[PDB]
Symmetry: C5
Subunit: 336 residues, 5 copies
């Protein structure tokens, strides 16, 4: 029996190696296999990865006439001491178990141990949509010991920044992913003390041109279309009125359609500001002709009682586009 080469029953494996003395160092490496999904309303993401641990335990040393190591599956884990890592700020997680538990242990003749397992985790990520669709988001995954403070267990990245590897084909449907790197920081709990925490960081960006074409283009086109009425004969009332009211209806249907396709986040975003300013411009173009028609009727009635282009159209033809251009300059200087 291979489990008799390790004196399992001759040691108390409820205590850590080196108990009573200096803390035992534990090194960590991570390989990221895929990014599975992201939820903008609930603000979280899901990842699948391999987690590997390295440490030494003299109680597991065994004699050998060669330098070959012994390999075990997950059934040995319950018989020896292993580190208790957990994921901070996670919502749910599990260890894969088909066709059996995806866990491995390798023991060297001198007592060095490698511990490897495959896991899927869902973690929280606070997001800010104020600058949508030009926003940038930063996310992280955090690893910590549950029960051992830094006086008993010292947790560190085994090879610094070389400890993190990512799959060549990692991708998300609606985002671009960039800038993977690692950091470390100490955390304090008033209940028990100081702990080491490890971080994996990355950044997300959107495809700007899709949103420009889908949203900003039609609204600008409809605003430009509302300016055509300034060049139409003011005596053609049955042509001037329906054009304005139909332009208002078209802009309203565009805004409703755009609202239906964005994530349901109930606060003000940059694209909403652009759309509602455009709507106001279209509304004012109808008020302009109402004023023109009333003044012309008044003048004709006065002339008959006593017995060319109106100035308002001439000024509007210049004033409306200049104001829209100025608004665009200010908007794009503010929101980049």
């Amino acid at each position: 029996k291979s489990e008799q080469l390790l004196r399992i029953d001759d040691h108390d494996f409820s205590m850590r190696p080196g108990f009573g003395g200096p803390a035992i160092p534990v090194g960590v490496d991570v390989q990221v296999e895929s990014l599975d999904s992201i939820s903008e309303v609930d603000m979280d993401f899901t990842m699948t990865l391999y987690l590997r641990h390295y440490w030494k335990d003299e109680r597991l040393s065994f004699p050998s006439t060669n330098n070959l190591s012994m390999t075990f599956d997950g059934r040995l884990v319950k018989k020896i001491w292993v580190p208790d890592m957990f994921f901070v700020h996670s919502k749910r997680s599990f260890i894969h178990d088909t066709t059996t538990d995806n866990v491995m242990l390798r023991v060297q003749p001198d007592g060095k141990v490698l511990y490897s397992l495959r896991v899927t985790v869902t973690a929280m990520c606070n997001m800010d949509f104020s600058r949508f669709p030009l926003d940038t988001q930063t996310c992280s995954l955090e690893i910590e010991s549950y029960a051992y403070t830094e006086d008993d267990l010292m947790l560190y990245w085994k090879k610094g920044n070389d400890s993190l590897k990512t799959d060549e084909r990692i991708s998300l449907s609606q985002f671009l992913i960039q800038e993977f790197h690692t950091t470390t920081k100490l955390a304090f709990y008033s209940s028990t003390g100081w702990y080491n925490r490890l971080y994996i960081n990355f950044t997300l960006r959107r495809h700007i041109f899709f949103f420009l074409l889908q949203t900003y283009f039609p609204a600008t086109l409809m605003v430009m279309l509302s300016w055509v009425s300034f060049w139409i004969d003011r005596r053609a009332v049955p042509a001037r009125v329906p054009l304005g009211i139909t332009t208002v209806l078209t802009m309203s249907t565009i805004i409703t359609g755009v609202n239906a396709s964005m994530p349901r986040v109930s606060y003000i975003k940059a694209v909403d500001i652009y759309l509602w300013v455009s709507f106001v411009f279209v509304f004012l173009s109808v008020l302009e002709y109402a004023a023109v028609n009333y003044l012309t009727t008044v003048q004709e009635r006065k002339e008959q009682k006593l017995r060319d282009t109106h100035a308002i159209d001439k000024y509007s033809r210049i004033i409306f586009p200049a104001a829209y251009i100025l608004f665009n300059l200010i908007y794009w200087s503010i929101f980049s």
Copy 2:
């Protein structure tokens, strides 16, 4: 073996400490890690937290030449007595178990015990949407012993209002969160007796300006647009009629779009009252011109058989805006 320092087999751990005498006090602290989601149709919310217990048991005392404590994981829990807390009015819950069970026990030389675990819970919350979008909601999470009455177990907050801590970055996508605090109250069950219950309370609010801009603004603009027809020449029938009918169509599409984006709650809310009153105003503006056209035709026919602005337009130009202003004053005095 560390489990032989505690005389595990020398005591009956199916009975409570102090059995037969006064009740044993148990103190509780809570740390809230995140708020995961909220469901308005099903009326519930989800939270992740750390739960910690404090009590003393003389049967667990062990000799020591120093003042160091001993730490165990979840495997020891089945061998000793622990308190049986559960969450009242919950729908589902679980204890996290990656990479192992997230449970810890620490025992002092004199028998003081700390018991800590990490849990996720979904709890019910009755909501009232009568004042939407200006509504305010209050929610709570409740903790109680399953099997021990106040004569056997005395449950209390360990440090009063200092027993509750919350994460600095706790947030929800569509709500603002404020005013965390704790309370206690006694509950009675006719089957078994009186029990102590602990509460965690907080309040939720919406972003008002987003809803004002998205809903109240367009409806007011369309009502103001329907008043333009009162200043148009009454002889221009092919201009007056299509304008009114198209305004009605636009208002209908706005209301349908707004209904499509709110939570599916099937009873009358304040925003519905505002929208349908506005719709009625638009409808009456079309009836007004129908009456004007009929009366003018009657007069012309009578004059020919025998062989300026109509008064109705003049009165409507004043009466419609004043009534709308009065409705707004009453509405906003009622709904704040």
Copy 3:
């Protein structure tokens, strides 16, 4: 050890108390904590409750110098006989287990037993939507023994109609709940015999005024709007035609929007009958003017070749509203 006060190993607990003789009576009480959700397309509902059992077993009697009882958790259940209740016509269910199994046993000195547990269940409920939105639904939850016929186990409500309690704040988002009560009935299985079955009954209703305002009001308004054309000068063709076609478009958009917001049930309901009759009325109003225009043109051409209000408008002004009123009287006398 408390489990040695009960002679656990001195009895066969695979057989029922009173084996070989008369059936053992078992009394039941229920406390309903909440109603969690309802699904109209799948026709089911979800509930959380406390289930309590009462019976006597002389094999569990123990000596005592007082009248104190002994309390155990779920670990003792596997060592003694307990009743095997299950929920008839259910789709899924589970027993809550945080922070431990929510199960309790209390044993009196003379052998009386109380058995209590907390459970969540999803149960089927056939619904009929013919009269929507004026429909009423009745639902039930059923409890039965799996393996014991009425000759071996007699199941009954412990205190009649006083055995059922409900929470003061029980509610559903889209329904009103009323009339909780209990019944019993005998059921027959050809495979094994007769069994006792217990029932919990309740009724659901909708909020009528919300549906009236959202659906019936706009359709009636559009039908009334289509009657305006009967008072407009028949010589104004470019005003009469667009009005009718735009009214048809508006009614179509209303019907599509209403269909999008109801539960996806694919058979004919009362509200569909009302909407499509209204649509037919709007269609006929356009055919009327087509006939009027053709006849007028024919008359003018005939008069020129040889070289006031048309009767159809005069009759339509009376006939259309009277027919609509008659339809409403018949509809509301049929559907209440």
Copy 4:
């Protein structure tokens, strides 16, 4: 102890009864409790049922002074041999376990055994939507032994067609259910040999009148409405043009609304053919008036330079309805 009346430890229950000789016959009965749901996009359905097995085993015979049988729950199953049935072509399944495992065993004095359990299963069903909404679907559930060929285990329906019972109130929200019956057939696996397979068959149909009223009626009405323009004076251009373009807009909104309410199946169905032919008819009605207006203008210009009803309208008034009637005759002769 009742388990000592059966000599459990005196037999090897890892081998089948009759090992080494002829195959052991096993009879099956099924009772269907409900149909829980159906998914058209994923092509599967869910059912809850009772499964019962009958066979004889002389090793379980016990002496008795009467003819009473002994009953056990699921804990005995692990100690004896039972048949290993599984569901072919299923996606997921489970055995109900509240308040305990829903499993029963009854043993007669001579060794006859009844084995009963309650299960829920989701099974695949390939569907064809070419003739929607006039399609018919056939579904089946299949039962087979995992490890025993027909040389070792003979599986059959215990009472032929009387072995299947269904609940009196079985129903689905959007389908009608008819024609339950059973069949059997032999299946071959190249890895191990021939196996017996049992089938449960049934048929599904839709409610035709709901779909006729919701889809076919409005499209026919709009096609008939487009024919009104053929009777309007050709000199009324501002009446003829807007009518045609608005009819096109209305038909487009109807088609979009209809597409939004059907299951998302991305290939051509019969109702799509009907809708797009109707759309083409509406388009051609606008081209007709364009031609008429151009020809009239040409004639007037020619007459002035040199210095009644147009034939196209007269022919269209006859030709359009006859072609639509012919299309309807062909369509309904093809699709029933």
Copy 5:
């Protein structure tokens, strides 16, 4: 006892057969039962299959007077050595367990073993939607040993390309499936070494004609409809203007409806290019008439102050269709 014919307690089954020498070959066969679902937003697919293993172990040989083999269920697996296969790049998986675990073991007298189990797996598949709806996708499922390198375990397809079988009725609702085949390749891990990997490959395609009819047809029809205005009398302003604005509204509603029915992928696809070019064509047709009307008014005013078809219409009647045809030729030569 059949488990005593195999000397289970006489061997260490924590080590592989042939330990210390050449690697043990393991052959694999696969039978695919169904394809359950596909998710375009999350980029994954789900499959159900049978997995079979073949190898030899002299420690399991048993004496026999015949050539009959012995069969066991899943309970024996924990007592002997078996290979540890797992699925690479998977998100979740499980082994079916109704009515018991779907696992079988067959052992020949000379020690040959067959190991069979039924499993469901969800696997990732990166997709590219640039050419939608004319895109083609390729997917794969991968199998590998967790803990044994190629020096200890040699994994191969048992019968080459004949090792893969697929069900005759395998189908997906929205895709066509073709070209199943197998491959193999060696993979390197810096942590432990070289491993053998097996692949199952297949291809997916869409139904092109459904998308052509639903999307490309209406847009082309509306572009052709906008050209009618070039043949209408330029003096009929109240006919020319509303036609153009209503055509713009119709095209906008078509684009919104089409966007609502495609998978929510936020980057530019081929069908979007076609739709927005068509929209631009419709917009330019309105600008054309604006210019014509202004120039005519200028000429009339000049002539009166001093006291036929306009050229722009004549050129547009030719230029617009030729440009649209050229765009179509380029588009369909690029996108096939």
